[PDB]
Copies of this chain bind each other. A is one copy, B any other.
Amino acid sequence: GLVPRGSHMRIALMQHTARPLDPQHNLDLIDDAAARASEQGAQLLLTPELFGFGYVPSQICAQVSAEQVDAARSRLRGIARDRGIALVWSLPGPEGPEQRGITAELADEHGEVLASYQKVQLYGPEEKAAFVPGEQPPPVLSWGGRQLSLLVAYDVEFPEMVRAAAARGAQLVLVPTALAGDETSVPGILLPARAVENGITLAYANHCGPEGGLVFDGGSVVVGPAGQPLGELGVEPGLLVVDLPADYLQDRRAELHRNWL
């Protein structure tokens, strides 16, 4: 409903089913969600991993050109500006098909790209055959009165990746994902710990349905710093809208830890 008293940030997560290799369809779905989110007074929309082309790594590598990626990117920056909402998307990277990774980018409500990130932790042999892993830590930036960061999918399952964001000041970590196979331990067990162990909030936006030979779990969720869900979806398409309201990060002996991994 109405924006509450103690909240100045309202976010939205898109959970839907993409059509493999049909960016016009999938980007129309993101535009629809962006509009709906903005109508409900959200200031940012998070969407799932590789949504624009579908989660089809091998087919992205074989069939999607750099010019097609750029065309999608341009449309998404357009959606952010035209729907007046910050937008996090995930696309192949901008290089050629043999040299690019899986990315996440944040555009503000004016359409400016504020931050870009390449997935460090690729999942499985298909991703590793289709994409180059990222080599840079997660970005952290001020937006909306807080420090936001980006990670993609499998990345959040490594405590190191979330710690790398929180070490740089992250408060709100936004994670496009694509999680299939009834993997309940990721949102059920790992995400709450990532939140608690860093004192942060995490938003996790999944696909949810038949798509590319998989059946995605849905279960999109926003987890706060106590490890509790602030909002969660089930298995069907939906738009989750959430108002956001030990000192592990100081106590950790990082100079020793770094030598022990």
Among A180-221, those with CB < 8 Å from B are: 185, 189-190, 192-194, 196-197
Q: Tell whether A251 is near chain B: CB-to-CB under 8 Å.
A: yes
Distance in Å: Cβ of A139 to nearest Cβ of chain B: 12
**When the two chains form their complex, are residues A256 and B190 in contact, meaning their CB atoms are under 8 A apart?**
no
On chain B, the residues within 8 Å of A256 by CB distance are 120, 135, 137
Contact A226 B193 (CB under 8 A): no
Which residue of B has the minimal Cβ distance to A226? B185
Kindly supply a per-residue 1/0 record for chain A positions 121-146, scoring 1 wherever the CB is within 8 Å of any chain B CB and 0 otherwise. 10100000000010101000000000
Q: How large is the interface on A (under 10, 10 to 19, 20 to 34, 35 or more residues)?
A: 35 or more
Bound CA–CA A119/B120 (angstroms)? 32
Looking at chain A's contact residues, is the secondary structure mostly helix, strand, loop, or mixed? Answer: helix
The reply on A114 being an interface residue by CB < 8 A is no
Considering the complex, which residues of chain A in the window 128-177 have a beta carbon less than 8 Å from any beta carbon of chain B? Answer: 133, 135, 137, 154, 157-161, 163-164, 167
Q: How far is the CB of A137 from chain B (nearest CB, A)?
A: 5
Contacts of A227 in B (CB 8 A): 185, 189
Q: Is A5 an interface residue (CB 8 A)?
A: no
Residue of B whose beta carbon sits closest to that of A158: B252
Given contacts A157-B197, A157-B246, contact A251 B189 (CB under 8 A): no
Report chain B residues within 8 Å CB of A189.
192-193, 196, 227
A248 contacts which of B157, B164, B246, B248 (Cβ < 8 Å)? B157
Are B123 and A246 touching (Cβ within 8 A)? yes
Q: How far is the CB of A35 from chain B (nearest CB, A)?
A: 36
Q: Does A254 contact B (CB under 8 A)?
A: yes
Q: Are B163 and A253 within 8 A (Cβ)?
A: no
A259 at the interface (CB under 8 A from B): yes
Q: Are B261 and A259 in contact (CB under 8 A)?
A: no
A112 to chain B, nearest CB (A): 26
Closest 8 CB pairs of A and B: A193-B193, A159-B159, A164-B260, A160-B257, A258-B258, A254-B261, A137-B260, A189-B227
A to B CB contacts below 8 Å, 6 in the list: A137-B260, A158-B257, A160-B260, A167-B261, A192-B193, A258-B261
